[PDB]
Design a protein around this ligand. Sequence first.
Ligand code: GDP
Ligand code: BEF
Ligand code: MG
Ligand code: ZN
Lengths: 311, 113
Amino acid sequence: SADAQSFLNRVCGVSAARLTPCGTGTSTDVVYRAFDIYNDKVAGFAKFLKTNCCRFQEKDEDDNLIDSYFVVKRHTFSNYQHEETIYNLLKDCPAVAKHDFFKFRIDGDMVPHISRQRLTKYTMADLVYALRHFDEGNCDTLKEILVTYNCCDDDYFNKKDWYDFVENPDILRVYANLGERVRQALLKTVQFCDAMRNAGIVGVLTLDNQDLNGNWYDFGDFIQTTPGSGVPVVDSYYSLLMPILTLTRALTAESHVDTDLTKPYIKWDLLKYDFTEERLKLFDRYFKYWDQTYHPNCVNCLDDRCILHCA
Amino acid sequence: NNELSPVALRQMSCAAGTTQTACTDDNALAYYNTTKGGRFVLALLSDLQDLKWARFPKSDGTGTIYTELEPPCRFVTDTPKGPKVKYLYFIKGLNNLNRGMVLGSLAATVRLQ
Ligand SMILES: Nc1nc2c(ncn2[C@@H]2O[C@H](COP(=O)(O)OP(=O)(O)O)[C@@H](O)[C@H]2O)c(=O)[nH]1
Ligand code: BEF
Ligand SMILES: [Mg+2]
Ligand SMILES: [Zn+2]
């Protein structure tokens, strides 16, 4: 053969990347994953099935499989030139996943591949769909995001009523261990939105294009404008994510003395009650490109649909 | 595949104003969205570089209204016939979605570099 083990060697490159195949040769891999769609035919936040992607895992020196997947994608040839002229501009932002574009001999042609380097197994839409569509007899995707990131152990799911808030109130501590993986994937969206504005790129940000590290990666429905005027559309990314920002207690590192989860707590003045200049600085740090006026004190709001927004 | 404006827009007509006061009969140009509601023009352009307010005409009788502008952003906007500079002020109070449809239509479907 050797036409299969050569692919495993072209997917790799300057990196070490001791990969192991997962799609049985030079073929793709079929997965069932959550997506946020809007394309003139379909619309919704639903679990669809993917078929255009080949996944290669990765093992470390000690020959143990780690959380690193190379996801090479097959598609048209006009996408190739369009996802390479937008990546060559958004490649200096540290919140963008490394891309590698090449052309390979599948059968009788030169077909193009786009490979993303060192992703995670799941996206941020897989974690949001799991906690908003909960089934206690179908929760395999949640019992893996919780074990892969050392929130609990595989023997924690043996006790019964472990998912219950009223019978096992210790599940609010196993969920709060995802609060810093989610808080650091909120600071990388505001870097990507800044880099997307200085370069002139316009596109909709959806949560299935940010893995569980904060890295972003589908630039195939973005347009290009003159530099300095780019418009990140973040309205189904923040709104769908909102119920997870208090369940996982994301902003619990803001109570510390340097926003460090190690240094001690902030000792506030006991006679202080305003907190309006720190409420407007928390909105700018995490929700910078959310385009709607925020009133910290709801006595300055404009109707009853503004009180509900700003509260 | 979240796509921005999966269907294109149309319409370009009428005028707007340059001098909050003047807007005598013909100043600048309005762009797009008849807007199902009735008439809601999303964006505005100009052949000049001076426009504070704009009394852009609209339907019914009270059509007169101050469709003011904000700090602009200009582009080469090369006309197929030749070069032509056009400063793009956006309708005051536009949200990031509408400025996406507008930008997508007049750049990807028009000749701009
Ligand atoms: N992060 C990650 N995503 C994966 C993996 N395997 C499959 N996926 C799915 O692949 C998608 C990547 O999107 P992409 O291929 O860039 O865009 P699309 O082909 O237009 O949907 C994610 O939304 C996931 O749902 C994996 O190992 N890691
Ligand atoms: F159509 Be995919 F979002 F690159
Ligand atoms: Mg995608
Ligand atoms: Zn308000």
